[PDB]
C-alpha cells in the first residue's frame, strides 16, 4: 500500500497528504514521534538517513523528501483525481515554468514561512518567547516574495499558469499556519495574493489536513 | 539563440554552463556584473524578479533558477550529447531516485558547500577574515552529508544509480572550489567519495568552467 511515515503537524508531511487527497488515493499515515526523537533513530534512519519526515512508500518503492514525493504522485497517478501537473503536461516549456515555481517556493518562500511559524506557533506550545526582531525581519522577506507573486498573479490565475499545480499546492501547509498568525496581513493586504490564498486553502483536500 | 545571463565565477552559473557543454550546445554567456549591482536593477530584474544569476533564454523561452534550467536542457536536448537523465528516462521510479538526489544536494549539500566557499574563497579576494568557528561547524555538517554519500556510493557507481546524471552534475561547481581549499580533506579521506569526485571533476565539460 501507500504509507506516509511522518508527523501530522509538520508542513512537509502535510504537503504529501494534500497531494494524496487531491488524487483521492488511499494511504496509511504511519506516525513518527518527533517528540521522542524517533526521527533520529533506527529504524527510521533506514528510511531517511538525514533523519527528517516525511518518508514514503508505494509498494516496494521507498522515497523521502516531500517535493520528490509529490512529483512522483502527480506522475504515477496522473489520471487519477485532480491532475497536479500542467494541463499540457507533455510540453517541456510549460513544465519548465512550473519547475521554476517549485524551485521558487523552495528557495524564497519556504525558509521564510517556516521560521515565521516556528517563532509564532511552535514556541507558543512550550511557552518559549517569540523573538519580535526575528519575526519583523522575516516578514520583511515575505512581503518582498509576496510582491513578486502579486505581479505574477495579476496575469495568471495560479502561479504556474491558468491551472492549480504542484507549485500552488506546495505553498498550502505553511500558508494555512500563517493565516492563524498576525502574518496574515501580508496576504490580506495584497489583493491578487489574498484571492489566490482563498482558492488554495478553500480546497477540500487542503482542508483535510488541518 | 541560447544565452546565459550570469557570472562565470558563480556556482549556480557554472552548473548551467556544465550542462550546456555536456549537451554539446553552442551558447552565449552574457556577463552580468554582480560587483556593480547590475543584478539588482533593470532590465535584469525583468529576467529574474528575485535578482539572482543565472537567468537564461532559449529562443522566446526565458527561465531562471539553475536546477530548473539544467532539467530543461536534459529534456529538451535529451537525444544529443550526454544523457543527463537516467538511462531509462521514461521510468517514473528511476526518475524519483534521481529527483530525491537533486533535492538532497539542494537542501543538505549546497548551503553547507556555499558557506564554506564564501568563507575561504570569497572573503580572500577582499582581505576579509575567514571565520574559523563557522568553517569548523559547517565542515561538521558536510562531513556527515558525505558519510551518507559514502554509504550510497558503495552500492552504486553514482548517486542516482550506475550512471552519471543531473544529480551528480549539480555538485561539480561547489566541489571544484572546495578542492582548492583545506576542506578537500573531507572528500579525500572518504574512499568512494574520493573516486566519485575525481570521476566527475575530470569530465571535459567540468574542466571547461574551472
Ligand atoms: C506547529 C508548528 C509546525 C511548523 C513548525 C516549523 S518547525 C521548525 C522545523 N525546522 C526544521 O525542521 C529544520 C530543517 C529544515 N526544515 C530543512 O529542511 O533543512 C521546520 O522547518 N519544519 C518544517 C516542517 O514542518 O516541514
Ligand atoms: C508539534 C509540532 C512539531 C513540528 C515538527 C516539524 S519538524 C519536520 C522536519 N522536516 C523537514 O524539515 C523536512 C524538509 C525536507 N526538505 C522535505 O521537504 O521533506 C524535521 O524532520 N526536522 C528534523 C530535523 O531537521 O532534524
Ligand atoms: C568567488 C568564489 C565565490 C564562491 C562562493 C559564492 S559566495 C555566496 C553567495 N551568496 C549569495 O548569493 C546570497 C544568496 C541569498 N542572497 C541569500 O539570502 O542568502 C552564493 O552562495 N552564491 C551561489 C553562486 O555562486 O551561484
Ligand atoms: C566574486 C563574485 C563571484 C561569485 C558571485 C556569486 S553570487 C550568485 C548568486 N546566485 C545564486 O545564489 C543562485 C541561486 C538560485 N537558487 C539558483 O540556483 O539559480 C546571486 O546572484 N546572488 C545575489 C543575491 O542572492 O542577492
From Swiss-Prot, chains A, B:
This is Glutathione S-transferase F2. The lineage of its organism: Eukaryota, Viridiplantae, Streptophyta, Embryophyta, Tracheophyta. It catalyses: RX + glutathione = an S-substituted glutathione + a halide anion + H(+). Keywords: Auxin signaling pathway, Cytoplasm, Detoxification, Endoplasmic reticulum, Microsome, Oxidoreductase, Peroxidase, Plant defense, Stress response, Transferase. Residues 91-210 form the GST C-terminal domain. Glutathione binds at residues 10-11, 39-40, 52-53, 65-66. It comes from Arabidopsis thaliana. It holds the Pfam family GST_C. Its main location: cytoplasm. GO terms for cellular component: apoplast; chloroplast; chloroplast stroma; cytosol; endoplasmic reticulum; intracellular membrane-bounded organelle; plant-type vacuole; plasma membrane. Expressed in the root-shoot transition zone and root tips. Binds auxin, endogenous flavonoids and the phytoalexin camalexin and may be involved in regulating the binding and transport of small bioactive natural products and defense-related compounds during plant stress. Binds a series of heterocyclic compounds, including lumichrome, harmane, norharmane and indole-3-aldehyde. In vitro, possesses glutathione S-transferase activity toward 1-chloro-2,4-dinitrobenzene (CDNB) and benzyl isothiocyanate (BITC). GO terms for biological process: auxin-activated signaling pathway; defense response; response to cadmium ion; response to cold; response to oomycetes; response to zinc ion; toxin catabolic process. Its EC number is 2.5.1.18. The keyword Transferase applies. Induction: By ethylene, auxin, glutathione, salicylic acid, copper, paraquat, acetochlor, metolachlor and the pathogens P.syringae and Hyaloperonospora parasitica. It is found in: Cytoplasm, Cytosol; Microsome; Endoplasmic reticulum. It comes from the Eukaryota. The keyword Iron does not apply. GO terms for molecular function: camalexin binding; glutathione binding; glutathione transferase activity; peroxidase activity; protein domain specific binding; quercitrin binding; salicylic acid binding.
Amino acid at each position: 500500500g501507500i504509507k506516509v511515515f511522518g508527523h501530522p503537524a509538520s508542513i512537509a508531511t502535510r504537503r504529501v497528504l494534500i497531494a494524496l487527497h487531491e488524487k483521492n488515493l488511499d494511504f496509511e499515515l504511519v506516525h513518527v514521534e518527533l517528540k521522542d526523537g524517533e526521527h533520529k533513530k533506527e529504524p527510521f534512519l533506514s528510511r531517511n538517513p538525514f533523519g527528517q519526515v516525511p518518508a514514503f512508500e508505494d509498494g516496494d518503492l521507498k522515497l523521502f523528501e516531500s517535493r520528490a514525493i509529490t512529483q512522483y504522485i502527480a506522475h504515477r497517478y496522473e489520471n487519477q483525481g485532480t491532475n497536479l501537473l500542467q494541463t499540457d503536461s507533455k510540453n517541456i516549456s510549460q513544465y519548465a515554468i512550473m519547475a521554476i515555481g517549485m524551485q521558487v517556493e523552495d528557495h524564497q518562500f519556504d525558509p521564510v514561512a517556516s521560521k515565521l511559524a516556528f517563532e509564532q506557533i511552535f514556541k507558543s506550545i512550550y511557552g518559549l518567547t517569540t523573538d519580535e526582531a526575528v519575526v519583523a525581519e522575516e516578514e520583511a522577506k515575505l512581503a518582498k516574495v509576496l510582491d513578486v507573486y502579486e505581479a505574477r498573479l495579476k496575469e495568471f490565475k495560479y502561479l504556474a499558469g491558468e491551472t492549480f499545480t504542484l507549485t500552488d499546492l506546495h505553498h498550502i501547509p505553511a500558508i494555512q499556519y500563517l493565516l492563524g498568525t498576525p502574518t496574515k496581513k501580508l496576504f490580506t493586504e495584497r489583493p491578487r495574493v489574498n484571492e489566490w490564498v482563498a482558492e488554495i486553502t478553500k480546497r477540500p483536500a487542503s482542508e483535510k489536513v488541518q
